[PDB]
């Protein structure tokens, strides 16, 4: 065992649990008290005061649940413990590889033990409906899967077994976090699933256990209509929009466009015609003077299209923006379609740059800690800010 | 013979440390009688002169004859956190055959921590030291119910079918089994009690946490409070916490006011005074607090069914059951921002309120019965720009009942008089004027007074409003006006806003757009000298 360490003045995180749902709460006391049976958790009495939430999900169309721990305090706690063991470099052609396949890697984690003092800080109660029975309180006693540290530890070790697989086939790059490993061929599809294969024997032959595709992924840039004959309203808007725009794309320029019947059409001006058209091109261009600080974290920003369509920002500046995208499916759930969009906003930004980022939900804090949990299929867990203004970005993107 | 749960104190502290007041012999007589049958109970030991702390006991009639108590309020500033919802009468199932039992004071039958008995004497002004748990200990539940957990899950165990919960001193056990054999497996569970040294002390009614259970249905027995002109200060610490737990059964209790007077106050000599004014909240509250609650018990094997009403202006009813005419369980819900709402919001609001408590109380969400029609919820699900969901319902119809009163057009309207508005405000006086600016050109600026930056827009929009037919088009140079008028609310604390919402339900067609500022853009050019 390696010994854990907290940040200096920082105790174990105390968030209480909120409720859950009676299958669920059924399902998660036989996956706890198996575990307790494998002597991979103890119980403990009132003495440890820490907490951290539990919830228990289906990852894929498996008929089996997994519980999940929300260590978003104690990986906030113990983020000195990262520091002293830096993945460098974080692999740079994940981003480019024509296929990149996430195999679950959570269970090598139960093998290696937790340092001994740093067992207290991980615990939670699985409770009870009606709160008839207190809540059964445990202890981890391996090490956990969403802690900041799990992989910390396990990194030499596996690294270890991989290198037979770094030594034969070097286009392949495989990298990991806190639960899941990312495999990339730029090959044909066709062997890339069968390296998958060969990885996955490789793995279990020494005791460990949609698709993802970085080329395809594209940004997309904002257009700006051309109705044949636009009528004072529609000049109205455009400039509200573009006026906007400034904050992003500096080379604009509209004073010819703002020279001003709203029942009726008013030819453009040519002079405003040519501006316009050039403004036209330069925002139909790759964004200019952007590039990415490691030394602040990131941003991700979701604003609501309304019409079984999403659109999201991910930026670590104001009006300065890594990313942009949407996301669409074609009447259906709502929530749904946020928690799938949050997910796929953080599997993008752990292959791009290695990290989840900070979300500003459109969604009442309320509603979202009820049914966020439903339909959420990943082990790790971002950290979400709630946004209740409505700007004019959503009718400004798309 | 019952494992002790280890516990230590709070980080850099070495208390405690009060000098007892001294006493009054008549009354010490008392103190010494009760200590000296508590010791030979094995109960209270006689430490050595070396241990230095000290804490006060007073002695209490027990009735509104001394019995002992000793004040932990300075101990428990230095005891470790520990653990610490309530159970619903809505979430007994039906047992044919029930009984409540009540452990004899069983605070004195788990040890207390030997290591830390050094923090809890006891000085009669002949140091004493408590070796089971404090009757009054703020610690004493948590560890009293982990003992009460361990001790009884063996016989849980040897028992699937029996249901046995434990809150403070009441044993809720319950089973189908008949009575003639509930008795003879009660006597079972009382020996096993009484094996880990626990006592046991030595009918259609049923008296278990307050909540009185009936052969079909449930109450609560009602709740009422001791009432002298002052009253003893220790007892008010009791009756905050009466209160709070009133307040889970019945709400509308605040009791904040009262808490604080109590926390400010660390003495007994003065008799404290008491304010009028939470002293008459206090007795309006109760007079509420003279309502029978009812209920009864929940079958799992039929589904919820909730109901919502929309009784006025930001009052609602929360009525559940699982068959007609018997509530499960029935509340009420009002606006929490207060400032700026919709009726379609709160009717969402108060459905993720009651699915909040029916996953607490019951585990499974229900099918709730909203008022609202599907096409109304579905257009403001549609076009509101935020994310709600409501979970499996359908509509029932009420004679009052919820709609968005007005919309706002998506296309500008062919010959309406289309109308520009403008704002603008000052600091050092409060001078700035509104208006607006129209296609004919007519206007008016009426000097206004309190003139503020978000009022003066919000006030530029109604005085166009006022003075517009049907069919209008404004344009506003606010974002935060435009913000405020199209969230479609109902409800404001302005006057100035419920006169617009008042004057645009008028209105047929209207439609507003927005400008940038401080731009020239063939509008408000006529006044655009008005502030500068």
Redesign the interface.
Known sequence: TVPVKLKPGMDGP?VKQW????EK?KALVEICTEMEKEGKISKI?????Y?TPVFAIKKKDSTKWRKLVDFRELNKRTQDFWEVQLGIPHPAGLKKKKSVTVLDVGDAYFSVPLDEDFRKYTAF?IPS???????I?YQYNVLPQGWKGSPAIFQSSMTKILEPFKKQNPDIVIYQYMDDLYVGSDLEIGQHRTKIEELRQHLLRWGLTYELHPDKWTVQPIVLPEKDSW?V?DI??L??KL?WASQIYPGIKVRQL???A??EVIPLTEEAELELAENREILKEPVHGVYYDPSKDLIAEIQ?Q??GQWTYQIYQEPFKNLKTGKYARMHT???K??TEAVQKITTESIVIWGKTPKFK????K??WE??WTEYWQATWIPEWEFVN??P?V?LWYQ
Do not use: A
């Not at 409720?19 to 009676?22: A, N, R, S």
């Open positions: 105390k409720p859950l749902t009676e709460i009495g009132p003495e440890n005061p907490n109660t409906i009606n709160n008839e029975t207190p809540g309180r009528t309203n109205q808007k400039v509200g006026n703002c020279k001003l709203l029942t609501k309304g019409q759930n709502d929530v379609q946020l939900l459109p969604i009442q309320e509603t009820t049914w203004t409505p004019l959503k």
